[PDB]
Scaffold this active site. Structure first.
Site, PDB file in Angstrom:
ATOM      1  N   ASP A   1       0.812  -1.217   0.000  1.00 40.64           N
ATOM      2  CA  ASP A   1       0.000   0.000   0.000  1.00 40.64           C
ATOM      3  C   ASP A   1       0.848   1.272   0.000  1.00 40.64           C
ATOM      4  OD1 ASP A   1      -2.063  -1.930   0.385  1.00 40.64           O
ATOM      5  OD2 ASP A   1      -1.814  -1.743   2.559  1.00 40.64           O
TER       6      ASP A   1
ATOM      7  N   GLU B   1     -11.740   0.199  -2.593  1.00 39.45           N
ATOM      8  CA  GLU B   1     -10.797   0.754  -1.623  1.00 39.45           C
ATOM      9  C   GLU B   1      -9.664   1.509  -2.317  1.00 39.45           C
ATOM     10  OE1 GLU B   1      -9.075  -2.489   0.540  1.00 39.45           O
ATOM     11  OE2 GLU B   1      -7.722  -3.035  -1.103  1.00 39.45           O
TER      12      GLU B   1
END
Ligand SMILES: [Ca+2]
Ligand SMILES: [Ca+2]
Lengths: 323, 323
Positions: free
Chosen positions: A15, A223
Site C-alpha cells: 500500500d 478501496e
C-alpha cells in the site's frame, strides 16, 4: 524505466503512498509480515503492526533508504489492532500521518501522528479523529489552500456498516442495480487534528453521469482512494477489489462528482492491488505492489514502481499488471 | 413516607442516580424535554441534551435544590447526540461524572466529566473512554478500594452489537433458550480516565446456577445497572425493559456471578423504568420515575422516591408500581 522496478526486496511493504518532500521522494507503505493467522474473510491475516519510511533521490536507478520504524501499534494509546494503509500531508511546517486502526472495540478509526520531518519518528495523538470511520485515508493538498481526506473501503473496511457517517444496526451491502457505495470526502481543519465538516459521498458516475451500480464490480469503488492533479484536471484513482483493477475518474473540484474513465492497472499477482500516483523529476510514476517475491501469498506484498504516461487527451495509458 | 414523593414537579427528570456526598443527598438524573421529535423504534424521542443536579438534606419532606445545568452536549468536544443515564463517583478529592453519548457516528460511547464539587459544573474530557460502548454506566466504590463500572443496555443501548467488547458486523439479539446478554463490568484505573482492564460479563444466574435465557424477559437484563452493598451481601439491580420490572440479584464480590432473587418494583406508568438505591439517615430509598404528571408520555418522565425495606433473610420487600 522500461520495466517495473522493485524497491524493497528485503522486506514486504505494501500500500505505497509516495510524496515529494525537499526534492526527495518519500514512500509511506504498510508493513506486511507473516502472522500465524490463516486466511479469513474479515482480513485477519492482514495483521500489520508498524510503519517504515523509505526515501529515494532517483526513482529509476536510485538507491533506496530505509529510515526504519516510525510508528507501531504499541506506541498508540487507543490502539486495538491492524495498522492498514496510511497517508502523509505537509502543513504548518509539520508532517501529519493519517493511519487507519481498529480501536479497542474492533471498529476502524483514523488516528493522527505528527513529526517535524518527513522521515523522522511520528508521535501519535492519544485518541482517534472524532467521527472518523472505515480506512484507507488519502490526504490531498488542494489548490484552494485546504487539505481534503478521501477514505473508505468495502468489506473488511467496514464502510458498509455506515450510512451518511452513521453506523447501522446491521451492515448492508448494496446489490445489483442498486447504487454502489461511494468513497468519502471530508475537509480537514487547519490544525489537521480533526474534521472541519461532515464527510460526504464522493460520487463516481458513468459516462452518462449515473452513479455506478453495485453489480458493476469492474468500475465500482472498493478501496485505495487516491487523488492527484494533472493538466488542470482532477484524477481520482482507486482499487476495485474483487476484480483486481486500479481504475480512475476525472472531475473539476475536490467535491464534485467524478466520471469514470478507464483502467490504470490490470490485475497483478496477489488478490490486492494498491497504489499512489506522483510526479518526480518531470516523470509520473505508479507506485504499487504484487506478490511475486512471496510466490502468490496475498498477505505478503512487495512494493514496486512503474512509469505512468498520459495521452494528449488527458487519459492515462493503461499499465499491465503481472498477472 | 406513606406514599411515594415526586422530587422535581416543575420539570421532567428521569433515571435518578442518588449518592450521599458531605452528609447531603445528591441526585444525577437525565433531563427530558419536548424536542419536537416524534416517537420511533430507535428511541430518537429520548433526546436529552443536558444534565441537572439536585440535592436534599431530607428525602421525605425536605426542600429539593436545583443546582442548574452542569453539563450539556454543546460543551462536549466529541459530542454527537442524546445524553442518557449517567452516574457520578467520588475519588481523589474529585467528582467524576460518567455519561453515555452517541459519538459523531451515532455509536454509543461513555465519557468522563470532572468537577471539584458534587453539584458544580462538570468539565468533560475531549474524547470518550477507550474501548467504551453501550450506555447506562454505574460506578461502584468497592470495599477493596477499587472502582468498577457496570454498563450495558439492550436495543437502543446497542449492547447486542457487541460480543466480548468487539463490534459485530451485524447486531445479534439472542432468543429463547439461548443465554441472554449479560451486563458488563470493568475496573477503572486510578486517574479514573480510562479502563484498567478488559470489560467482562456480569453473569446473572437463576436458582439452579444457570444463565438466564433470552426468552425469560421477566428476569433477564435490559438496562439500568445498579450495584450496592447491604449486610454482607451485594445487590445488583436492573431494568427488564418490555416487562417493565426492576429486579435484583445477590453476589459476594463485584465480578462474581449474581443469582436472581425477585422483583423490587412492579410496572410503573410509562414504558421505561430506572432507579438507584441508597441509604440515607437510617432509611433506604428507591429513587425512580414514572409518567403520571405527563399523563402517560413515555419520554417525559418525573422523578419519585419510595422507602425500601428488607426482610431478615436479606430479601427486598416488593414495591407496588403505579401501572
Ligand atoms: Ca493509499
Ligand atoms: Ca444508572
Amino acid at each position: 524505466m522500461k520495466e517495473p522496478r522493485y524497491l524493497v526486496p528485503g522486506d514486504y511493504m505494501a500500500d505505497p503512498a509516495a510524496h515529494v518532500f525537499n526534492d526527495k521522494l518519500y514512500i509511506y507503505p504498510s508493513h506486511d509480515w507473516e502472522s500465524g493467522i490463516p486466511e479469513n474473510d474479515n482480513g485477519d491475516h492482514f495483521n500489520m503492526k508498524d510503519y517504515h519510511v523509505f526515501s529515494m533521490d532517483d526513482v529509476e536507478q536510485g538507491e533506496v533508504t530505509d529510515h526504519g520504524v516510525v510508528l507501531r501499534t504499541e506506541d498508540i494509546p487507543w490502539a486495538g489492532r491492524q495498522l492498514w494503509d496510511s497517508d502523509v500531508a505537509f502543513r504548518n511546517g509539520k508532517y501529519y500521518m493519517y493511519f487507519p486502526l481498529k480501536d479497542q472495540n474492533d471498529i476502524f478509526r483514523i488516528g493522527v501522528a505528527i513529526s517535524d520531518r518527513p522521515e523522522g519518528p511520528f508521535i501519535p495523538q492519544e485518541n482517534p479523529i472524532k467521527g472518523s470511520y472505515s480506512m484507507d485515508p488519502c490526504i490531498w493538498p488542494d489548490k484552494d489552500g485546504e487539505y481534503y481526506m478521501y477514505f473508505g473501503g468495502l468489506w473488511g473496511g467496514q464502510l458498509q456498516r455506515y450510512r451518511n457517517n452513521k453506523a447501522l444496526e446491521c451492515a448492508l451491502l448494496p446489490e445489483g442495480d442498486e447504487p454502489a457505495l461511494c468513497p468519502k470526502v471530508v475537509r480537514l481543519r487547519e490544525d489537521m487534528l480533526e474534521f472541519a465538516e461532515e464527510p460526504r459521498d464522493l460520487m463516481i458516475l458513468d459516462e452518462k453521469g449515473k452513479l455506478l451500480s453495485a453489480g458493476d464490480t469492474k468500475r465500482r469503488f472498493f478501496e485505495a482512494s487516491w487523488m492527484h492533479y494533472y493538466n488542470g484536471k482532477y484524477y481520482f484513482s482507486y482499487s476495485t477489489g474483487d476484480t483486481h483493477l486500479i481504475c480512475y475518474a476525472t472531475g473539476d473540484n475536490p467535491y464534485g462528482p467524478f466520471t469514470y474513465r478507464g483502467v490504470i492497472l490490470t490485475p497483478v499477482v496477489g488478490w490486492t492491488t494498491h497504489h499512489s500516483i506522483v510526479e518526480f523529476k518531470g516523470k509520473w510514476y505508479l507506485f504499487h505492489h504484487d506478490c511475486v517475491p512471496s510466490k502468490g501469498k496475498t498477505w505478503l506484498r512487495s512494493l514496486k514502481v512503474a512509469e505512468l504516461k498520459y495521452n494528449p487527451d488527458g487519459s492515462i495509458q493503461p499499465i499491465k499488471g503481472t498477472a
